[PDB]
UniProtKB/Swiss-Prot annotation:
GO biological process: L-homocysteine biosynthetic process
Organism: Escherichia coli (strain K12)
Pfam families tied to this protein: Aminotran_1_2, YhfS-like_C
InterPro entries in the record: Aminotransferase_I/II_large, OAc-hSer/O-AcSer_sulfhydrylase, PyrdxlP-dep_Trfase, PyrdxlP-dep_Trfase_major, YhfS-like_C
GO molecular function: cysteine synthase activity; pyridoxal phosphate binding
Lineage top rank: taxon: Bacteria
Protein name, entry field: Uncharacterized protein YhfS
Length: 361
């Protein structure tokens, strides 16, 4: 099948992103202050830890934005906070003609928003619908929601900005893996889970325009609302490791794809790289052995279900079922095909686990 995956960073490009983030750290933390472990609580004038503020400044700087806020609830929390700062309950939100991310749909339902739908793959239709229906804001997913999605993030954002429609991007599984996240190419705010970036459980980030971020910070009254200094430092730690380790993974996925396409595993009928929704391999077998292969692969070290995904815990490759939306659209595929996210493994390991599992069914 045909896909249009996001463009991965090379190892050289990834190093440059790593270095640029560390440069921002240096410019916001005197060295002795970086070794302070992270402060706690509702410090006067900030209503958050001093170190958390600093980390937020670093995040804003690193992603070419005015401001940032760390929030509870990871990626879902970030999207909720961002949407709540862009529109009111009962207002109109523009979304792409494809399945809305499940917890995002929950947020939409809990806010009583009216959805306006258009195919983002058709910029002409996008522009017409925006002019006619006058949405109060737009949400754009960075990763691919369905195989046929081929739109360029920056171009969709540019269209929205020209029409004066505030835009939020859901950048999960794209951050530190592509050249520009939403707030770097036209969005009013980007959002992402830090848990999916080798960071701490429960922590999400909203990064973008100060007026939006300030509205978010104003709602974070309570002690529990805050991200503690140590958690904030862990976000930076994870983010510094993210680009290079993912560039290594992107290389593994490309080499694995080439080997499979070259016939390394005769029992494989087809293989493709796809954003599903993170960039992974989709491997289809000639015979309906997918479930058996998944069972055998787990015994040989493959992760059988995700955590983050792409969290600090997820080191061995993930061999997993197909996504819900894809299975709905293609009811027979689940018997024949699987997703593989190599995580920190190499292609020879994935190939070996694949071959040994097939031999053992
Ligand atoms: Ni089959």
């Amino acid at each position: 099948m045909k896909t249009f995956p996001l463009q991965s960073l090379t190892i050289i490009e990834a190093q440059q992103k790593q270095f640029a983030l560390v440069d921002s750290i240096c410019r916001h933390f005197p060295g002795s202050e970086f070794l302070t472990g992270g402060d706690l609580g509702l410090t006067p004038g900030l209503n958050q830890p001093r170190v958390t503020q600093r980390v937020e400044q670093v995040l804003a700087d690193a992603f070419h934005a005015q401001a940032a806020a760390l929030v509870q609830g990871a990626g879902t929390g970030a999207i909720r906070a961002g949407l709540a700062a862009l529109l009111k309950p009962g207002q109109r939100l523009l979304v792409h003609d494809a399945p809305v991310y499940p917890t995002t749909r929950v947020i939409i339902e809990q806010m009583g928003l009216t959805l306006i739908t258009v195919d983002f793959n058709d910029l002409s239709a996008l522009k017409q619908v925006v002019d006619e229906q006058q949405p109060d804001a737009a949400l754009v997913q960075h990763t691919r929601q369905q195989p046929q999605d081929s739109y360029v993030l920056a171009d969709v954002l540019a269209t929205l900005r020209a029409a004066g429609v505030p835009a939020l991007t859901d950048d999960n599984y794209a951050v530190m893996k592509v050249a520009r996240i939403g707030c770097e190419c036209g969005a009013n705010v980007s959002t992402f889970s830090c848990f999916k970036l080798f960071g701490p459980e429960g922590v999400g980030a909203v990064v973008g325009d100060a007026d939006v971020i300030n509205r978010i910070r104003a709602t974070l009254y309570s002690g529990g609302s805050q991200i503690q200094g140590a958690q904030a430092l862990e976000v930076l730690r994870g983010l510094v490791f993210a680009p290079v380790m993912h560039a290594v993974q992107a290389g593994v996925s490309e080499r694995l794809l080439a080997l499979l396409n070259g016939g390394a595993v005769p029992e494989v009928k087809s293989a493709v790289i796809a954003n599903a929704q993170s960039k992974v391999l989709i491997v289809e077998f000639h015979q309906p052995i997918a479930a058996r292969v998944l069972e055998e692969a787990q015994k040989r070290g493959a992760l059988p279900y995700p955590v983050g995904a792409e969290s600090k815990y997820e080191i061995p490759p993930l061999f997993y079922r197909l996504s819900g939306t894809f299975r709905q659209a293609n009811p027979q595929s689940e018997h024949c095909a699987i997703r593989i996210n190599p995580n920190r493994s190499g292609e020879e390991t994935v190939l070996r686990i694949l071959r040994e599992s097939i031999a053992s069914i």
